[PDB]
Amino acid sequence: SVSAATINRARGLYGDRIAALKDAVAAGDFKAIAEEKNAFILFNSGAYPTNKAKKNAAIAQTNEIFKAIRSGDKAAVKSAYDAYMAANDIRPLPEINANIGQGYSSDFDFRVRTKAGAIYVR
Amino acid sequence: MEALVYTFLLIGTLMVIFFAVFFRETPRIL
Amino acid sequence: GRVPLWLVGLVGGFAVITIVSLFIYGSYSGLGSS
Amino acid sequence: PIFTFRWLAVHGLAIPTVFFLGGITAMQFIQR
Amino acid sequence: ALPWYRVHTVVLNDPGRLIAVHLMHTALVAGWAGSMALYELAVFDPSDPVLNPMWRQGMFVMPFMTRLGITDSWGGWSITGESVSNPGIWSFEGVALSHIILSGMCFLAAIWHWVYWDLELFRDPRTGEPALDLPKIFGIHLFLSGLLCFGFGAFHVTGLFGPGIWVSDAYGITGKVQPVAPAWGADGFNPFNPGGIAAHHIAAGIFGIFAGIFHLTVRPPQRLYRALRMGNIETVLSSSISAVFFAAFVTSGTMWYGAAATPIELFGPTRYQWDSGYFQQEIERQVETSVSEGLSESQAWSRIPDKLAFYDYIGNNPAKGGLFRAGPMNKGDGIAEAWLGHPIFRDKEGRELTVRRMPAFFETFPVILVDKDGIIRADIPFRRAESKYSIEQVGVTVDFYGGKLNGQTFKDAPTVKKFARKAQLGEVFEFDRTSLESDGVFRSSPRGWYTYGHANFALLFFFGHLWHGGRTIFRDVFTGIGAEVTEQVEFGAFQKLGDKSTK
Amino acid sequence: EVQFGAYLAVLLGTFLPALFLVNLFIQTEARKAGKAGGQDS
Amino acid sequence: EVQFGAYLAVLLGTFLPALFLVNLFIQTEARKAGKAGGQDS
Amino acid sequence: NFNQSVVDSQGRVINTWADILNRANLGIEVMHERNAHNFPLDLA
Amino acid sequence: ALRTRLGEILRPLNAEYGKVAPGWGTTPIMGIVMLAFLIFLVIILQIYNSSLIIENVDVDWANGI
Amino acid sequence: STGERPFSDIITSVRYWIIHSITIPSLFVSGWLFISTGLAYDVFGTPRPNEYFTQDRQQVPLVNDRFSAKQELEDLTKG
Amino acid sequence: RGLFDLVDDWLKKDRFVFVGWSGLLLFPTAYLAAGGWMTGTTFVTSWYTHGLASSYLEGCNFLTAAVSTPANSVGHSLLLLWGPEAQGDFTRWCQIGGLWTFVALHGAFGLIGFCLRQFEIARLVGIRPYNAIAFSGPIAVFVSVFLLYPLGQASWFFAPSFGVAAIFRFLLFLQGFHNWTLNPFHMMGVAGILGGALLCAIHGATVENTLFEDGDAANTFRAFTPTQSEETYSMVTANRFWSQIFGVAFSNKRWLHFFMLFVPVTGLWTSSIGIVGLALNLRAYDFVSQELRAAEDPEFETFYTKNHLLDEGIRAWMAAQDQPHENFVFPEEVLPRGNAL
């Protein structure tokens, strides 16, 4: 079953795995985008699994990334990669704390050893 | 008022068992 | 005949006991032993 | 009369059992 | 002589009494369909089709009446939210009355065949035995049923002659009985296309005609007539049961999972529309296209229809109730009155908190307030001693949008907790629990109850197939085994199994 | 607080099947008494 | 508002006397069938 | 008691079907006779 | 044995009884039709499961209107 | 009694032990070396005691989408 | 004779294992279902579907190894090897949990092929089909628990896995979430199975103990040949025993042995009706007025309300690690808990 927490998870797992490539837009690491092709594909499958109209929106927003890096215009790559994060709301997980936190309770969660992984042990 | 219905059925089964032991159809060898 | 059955179902029966006792041994060594 | 389906219906079991019990005795030693 | 369980086998040998008995059966069944539908008309409340539909009231017979086109009633009320001056013969009362006529007329016909078993028509020409030629009878009945299936698809669903079929939209806001052009491509096998239902009964009805014409002429071979025992009527029975429970796993499957044949605003939403949050994504999309139009938030939420908010609610699940909770859903939590509002929960940093909704498994799930990335900013503690995330510590504030509680902040920490418990389940409404003395605890839909009874009846009919599938094959040894079997039960001396022509 | 037609559904679900099965017994005892001609017919 | 055990007192006051008088009829029909020896005993 | 028996190379407990079995028992342990207990272990 | 009017009208349909084609009949044709009906049910089972996917066909609530 | 050579006949036969002194140690050591070389780790995709976690992800790797599980399992094992 | 007649002779040839027409359906499917359970419990993981360890290779005993259900991410898909979520690639088909559906869909036709085998033996041997009737119970338990129960729940994830501990929690899954012992369809099932083991213990004991002297050996087992015309236990003596001890006894061997057929079988039917109750979550979970009066009297405790507190122990504590995909994060103040433990 598609559910809400399955949408939350692939968004939480791979929204790290899209936004952290801000480091690779800067120098223009052309292999570091090609190694993360499946990150774009699987956030696309998980964040909009029932919504096919926003999914097929995020297909062409992903194609515009790879069409730009195939030519190589580093200006038009960031001009498309800004639009990808600003349409789909890509967000990494920031640091959580004692008041703002509890990322995980089970060790089965997808954020156990992440930087938004903490627990108020008490 | 359903404790009537409960005790009527429990004593109801206890009656049916009493007739089933002592008023049974006996088997005959014949 | 030429080899009796009680020798046969016994070296086979030893081989059950050796391997099943080996299953209890590595229940205490290796993985699954903490 | 070496085939007669009983050779098969024993070796249908017997060849996978010996091959898997050979595996399971290796599982008894594999360590972390 | 006969025990109580063999007591109907007396009518096997007399085919004139089978028809006498099937007519008494079809008089009880249609008598029930008329009398249960009259009972439901006495219970039904037409005053609110929005927040009090038919599935909310525990109507079992009425959704089957309206999905093929009975929308009006003699009391002037329409189920589509209209007002009709003259419904005609075919209303809810007229359909229910027509089954009581048919109950009375099939009752009298049942008596007439039970008195007159001596119809000549049931005799063999060759011998004098009472006999039914089952392959010709099947070819008759298959021709009629395939004709009637074709006429149903071509003239009722496509609406040439008939009124159509209930066809709703994707979210169960609007539906109406309307004709349907049949969908012939792969789109017809999409179950949620009502064009498949028209294209089904046309095409399947065509084969029901031309397989009728086949069985009206071609006689069975010896190989089937001996094996399948077509001179025996119980082979019809066992094979018919197999068709009947096969059809029940299909209907109870497409009930529970939904199809175009069982739409949302008729039987209730499915279970799987709560799981994916099927209506949440429709709420939030219609809000986003309203705030992209330029609207502020408090009138962005007020444009959401109330009926759509009713569907995103836990007490509207089929999987929410229980067995021995009997009656309508309104005996569960009450009559729905009006949508309160959409809570938005904010912390001291102006973030947004959503109470994580409960799955359909849990009768009770706690209150957990998570943000956009699913991290717990707040909860309600069970142990209140060392709790870090209590609402009185985090200072969660409540602000509603739309409904009767539009634009009302709540910084009052008890009431924040009260609306946090309400917002855990469903879109929060206000009810009427005092009308029928409704309890505080949930129920299930006609979608829950239909596939309950039929997934159980299909199981019992699996056993009845094996009983009569067994009794036909072993008709001769049904009363003992003989002494001839003693020779053929031996490992060896017959190189085949039981066959005295061998060795 | 207790549900309502359960007083009906139990007692008519006992007595109407209970009194039915009595009568398949009363039927035979009369039929076996009508068979062997005694003081009863 | 309607009184309570009247749902019981009517339906058990119908069916238990109705099903009783059925069985004095079922008794005779079996007794008259056991008398004249036919296919039934 | 097969709890935390399956351990990887690093040392972290890999969970089995025994662990969700003994996660039921934690659910029944913390609930049974819930005020008769005043002390942490259930010896009595 | 009580001939009626309708008994005589439907008397031909109960004429043959056990009149049987002499062995093997059309059972090769019946088997092929029954094999094609089974393939037809596997296709419906797998479209509906979405274990089989067709172009421009979704398994989802659509707005017939 | 069905026309077969009996079980207590074959199990005592000397010829029976001549074939089976070859094949039974052949299939046992083939079962040993199947995962003494750990080929099942690659055929059944079962993770090694090193391979429950990677350097990058240290979280429990559950599949999240129906259709694209072919891509999801390839990424969780890639690290 | 014809081709089909020669085919019919050779599979119905009497030999050590009877093949039969049903054996064309049984012996492939029953081999693979039993074979896929052995391979899945010795090699294949739960690590990507449940996040567990379930194989002898990873650390499991006989008691904790299991062929495990796939993820909830996959819905009710058939998990075909060629299917749209496996696409060939047996390594990926095992990690997604394809073997569980492989075992459950071949165990389904294996049980069909085994009941059809009981019809085929009973015809040609020439005997009444009451074994095939009595086997329809174990078909009903399989189909309703392993097929009908998941197909009303969210996905195949909620049927139980083929393993020793993995069934044990499905006993405790349906207790906490569904209050499964309280379902009276299950109570009829327990009465059928305990009453079935009752009748196996009675009729075993009374036959052994009303035996006749048929020899001078103190061993009595060697004083029987199967071809005897007489009875080897005194049915009159056995009737006089229980009628005088228990009060009520059998007097037919035909009615007795039907009753030993009837009681375990109709236990499994009525129990399997109720597990189609939970498939769609219509369940006997609470009594209402029993649960009313508790919420207006804090004095009023039953064993019944004691069980509900134990049920929310199972509901709340297990679920964070029961369904890992739904990502339940439970604070420790949220988790219900008694005093000191």
Added chain:
Amino acid sequence: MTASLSNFIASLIAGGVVVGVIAIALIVISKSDRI
């Protein structure tokens, strides 16, 4: 025609191969093992 469809006909064929390999193998022995 999709990639999911091309897999399915490949299994209809291979399903008919496995039935076809067995059914030919039954006939060939049963003629040689006549009775």
Added chain:
Amino acid sequence: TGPNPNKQAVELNRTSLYWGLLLIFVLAVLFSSYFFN
């Protein structure tokens, strides 16, 4: 019309009464309280 060569006697023993009553009364012990709730 005419008398049937079909109609027969229907029987139930004394024990089958006692099974049949104790079936109905004990199912009424089970499924009572569930109906009451």
